[PDB]
Every structure is written in C-alpha cells, then in structure tokens.
Amino acid sequence: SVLQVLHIPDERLRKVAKPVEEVNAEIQRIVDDMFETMYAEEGIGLAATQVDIHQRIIVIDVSENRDERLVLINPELLEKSGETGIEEGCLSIPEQRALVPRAEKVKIRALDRDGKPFELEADGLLAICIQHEMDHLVGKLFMDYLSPLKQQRIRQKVEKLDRL
Numbered sequence: 111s112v113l114q115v116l117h118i119p120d121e122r123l124r125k126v127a128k129p130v131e132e133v134n135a136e137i138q139r140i141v142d143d144m145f146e147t148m149y150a151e152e153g154i155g156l157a158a159t160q161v162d163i164h165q166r167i168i169v170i171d172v173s174e175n176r177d178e179r180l181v182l183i184n185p186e187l188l189e190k191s192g193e194t195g196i197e198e199g200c201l202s203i204p205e206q207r208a209l210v211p212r213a214e215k216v217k218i219r220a221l222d223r224d225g226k227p228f229e230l231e232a233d234g235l236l237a238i239c240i241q242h243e244m245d246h247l248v249g250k251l252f253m254d255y256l257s258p259l260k261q262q263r264i265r266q267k268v269e270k271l272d273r274l
C-alpha cells in the first residue's frame with residue numbers, strides 16, 4: 111500500500127520514535143509499504159515518523175536505477191567524521207530544498223528487513239541521506255538548521271502548494 115506522507119506544519123512530525131521491539135510480519139509490511147511510498151513519491155529515503163508510524167524504521171534507495179533497497183531498523187550511530195552539505199529536499203516539505211550541515215562519513219549499526227544486525231560505513235549521498243532519515247526519527251527536519259526567515263519562506267510555500 112502507498113501511505114500518505116505528513117507535511118509541515120503537522121506536529122506529528124516532531125514525535126520521537128520508539129525502537130522496533132521485534133522485526134516481524136507487521137514490521138515487514140510497514141517496511142514494504144514505506145518503500146512503495148518512497149518510490150511513488152520519488153524519494154531516496156523515508157522514515158516511519160513521516161507516515162505517522164512512530165517507530166525507528168527507515169527505508170532508503172540511493173541507486174541510479176532505483177533497485178537497491180536498504181532497510182535501517184533501530185539504527186545507531188557508532189562513529190562519524192568530517193563535514194559536508196548539499197541542497198536537501200524532504201517529502202514532508204514538498205518542493206523546497208536547502209543546504210544543511212552534515213557529517214561527511216558515518217558508521218552505523220542497524221537491523222535489516224529480516225531482523226539481522228549489520229554494520230554499515232557510508233559516505234557521499236548515502237551518508238547524507240542516513241543522517242536526514244535519522245533526524246526524522248528524533249523529530250528533526252532539515253529546515254530546523256536554517257534562519258527564521260528561511261523557515262518562514264519554506265512554510266509559506268508548502269502551505270500554498272498544499273492549498274492548491
């Protein structure tokens with residue numbers, strides 16, 4: 111199923127996700143529906159918070175052909191280094207993008223779609239995406255790193271888009 115993606119200024123986007131207790135069929139249904147949503151909305155990642163599921167579940171596909179699924183369940187940041195920043199957009203902040211500071215590289219541990227633990231070192235866009243996705247799990251959005259003026263401008267554009 112394709113799920114509705116919450117948009118600013120919805121307060122549900124600020125909720126802090128709980129850890130997944132067990133990776134079972136219910137969770138796999140959620141993961142699969144998150145992928146479907148992500149692809150339908152042309153994203154490269156999605157966090158459960160965005161679909162109003164406050165659990166630490168993240169789906170990602172940063173591949174050119176959009177056929178490389180990555181699942182981060184209960185991700186934990188182990189190490190990071192350097193700094194970087196690209197103009198990021200967000201499906202909860204439709205059509206707006208801005209550069210925000212991010213770690214260049216990250217090493218994380220998480221559970222996959224089967225509930226098996228794995229470690230992953232990432233750089234480039236994957237590291238940026240992980241960070242963005244992990245921020246959604248603690249109720250944080252890319253616009254939070256910007257000035258009040260920029261935040262207000264983004265808020266108004268999203269509301270108008272949604273109004274139309």
Ligand SMILES: CCCCC[C@H](CC(=O)NO)C(=O)N[C@H](C(=O)N1CCC[C@H]1CO)C(C)C
Pocket residue numbers: 152153154155156157160196197198199200201202207238239242243246
């Ligand atoms: C880059 C950090 C991760 C961005 C994730 C968002 C999806 C999101 O809202 N997840 O929470 C995305 O797909 N955004 C895209 C995005 O920002 N992109 C896609 C290509 C790289 C970057 C643009 O610079 C477009 C659809 C707005």
Ligand code: NI
Pocket residue numbers: 199200201202242246
């Ligand atoms: Ni986002």
